[PDB]
């Protein structure tokens, strides 16, 4: 690791600077370096890690979708043969995306999840594990696709079980986990009814717990509740 | 696409 | 060059795909590979090259400005010492920016400019040479800053001389060259009056030649004329 | 910042 000689605190400081500069690849590299120092991550640090890689992989996913769409059109009846280039370049972006996902999954497995004992850390990391297997599933087409899907499902399910036992229904990590697991059901697992049920139950149970919250906590929880509602509106 | 966070 | 084994036509095809996917680093790498095949570039190919590196360096410049601003605040009276990290990371981004500029300038020097005989190619490349020395000037602070500025000035001036002899005043390359040389005067050379004079004369001479143009040529020329006017409004 | 193209 090229960050091995940099202080942990300096890596975290530079991750925050990279964020302000919208340099998310740098941000991710700094936070990978910080994780590899071997200490547990604080709440702020976990979110720096997640923001960085979410932005990096999000851009890869958007590019992959553009190229996949072009590739699918090149294969319709009537298209002129353009050669191997569209497939090659889609494969290039795909392989880079898989590499980023494997990197994040590797950090979670060595050794963030096994040292995470508090609900807020363990659920956070298991959600990430589900998310990055979900991104692998989005591009998967081979002998391993079912197993990738089941790896996402299993991580999301463990996170869900912990979150229902240990966090209130308005907890933003619990809400975001449910939002994403619901999308997993709809888009990956071919289970739209499960997706809709999960989003609705999550929304309704959160609604009933809003009365316990401060104004600032209310703002955070209702933001994600609105995303649940947005998806329900898309799907119904 | 649907919303995730 | 890692693109040495890829066909020229495939590199150009993939540059266009990268553009559609907003993968401008890839686009620039593909177009560098195409230039290094040694053949002259067509009009479309020149613009693919320019779009790619403009987007890459534009993002670097935006990040550099964010970090420079943070660095300057850290050095005001009253600031708490944050350590070397802001300077280090600004330097990191700066060095990467300089590297990209040096790469583009190297392509122009080996051997795009020397083989460019037509006005539309030679002016295009000399404008690029001025632009990338201008970006180097934006971050320059040492013994070489005056020489970097003079290198930008000299490239812009040769481009201007050719464009006035060989292109009509509405030619979009001529207009864009004048726009950028005017910004060079205002922002780099501490010559706001020269910047304003150049923008106004360019605008007025273009206005008087619009009557010769087709509807599509009119749209292109008036777009850049509006940028000249926008700058004049900012500066007066 | 001013416009360039
Ligand atoms: N970027 C940065 N420098 C920083 C971000 C934070 C920070 C601190 C607490 C919670 C959060 N965020 C969350 O716990 C989640 O995101 C939310 C999104 C909307 C509302 C509430 C939370 C919950 C859902 C999954 C993704 C994380 C971040 C500190 S510093
Ligand atoms: N991106 C792409 N796949 C492609 C871009 C092109 C293409 C073809 C002709 C002219 C241009 N552009 C220009 O000559 C300039 O830009 C213009 C900007 C506004 C109006 C007119 C021109 C003139 C000013 C300096 C920068 C180049 C591009 C083909 S393909």
Furnish the topology, listing elements before pairings:
The complex is a heterotetramer, with two copies of chain A (236 residues) and two copies of chain B (5 residues).
Chain A: H1 8-20, H2 24-35, H3 43-74, H4 85-115, H5 119-139, H6 145-166, H7 172-188, H8 192-207, H9 215-235
Helix pairs in contact in A: 1-2, 2-3, 3-4, 3-5, 4-5, 5-6, 5-7, 6-7, 7-8, 7-9, 8-9
Chain B: no helix or strand
The complex binds the ligand N=C(N)c1cc(-c2cccc(NC(=O)C3(Oc4ccccc4)CCCCC3)c2)cs1 (2 copies).
CATH topology of chain A: Delta-Endotoxin, domain 1
Major pleated sheet of chain B = none
Structural class of chain B: little secondary structure
| Shape annotation of chain A | globular
Which cofactor or ligand species appear?
the ligand N=C(N)c1cc(-c2cccc(NC(=O)C3(Oc4ccccc4)CCCCC3)c2)cs1
What is the CATH domain class of chain A?
Answer: Mainly Alpha
- Strand proportion of chain A, as a percent range, falls in under 5%
Task: State the CATH architecture of chain A.
Answer: Up-down Bundle
Helix content of chain A: over 70%
Using the CA coordinates, give the radius of gyration of chain A.
19 Å
CA-based shape of chain B: rod-shaped
- Count of separate structural domains of chain A: 1
Element-by-element helix/strand order of chain A: HHHHHHHHH
Keywords (chains A, C): Cytoplasm, Nucleus, Phosphoprotein, Secreted, Ubl conjugation
InterPro entries (chains A, C): 14-3-3, 14-3-3_CS, 14-3-3_dom_sf, 14-3-3_domain, 14-3-3_sigma
Pfam family, one (chains A, C): 14-3-3
Subcellular location (chains A, C): Cytoplasm; Nucleus; Secreted
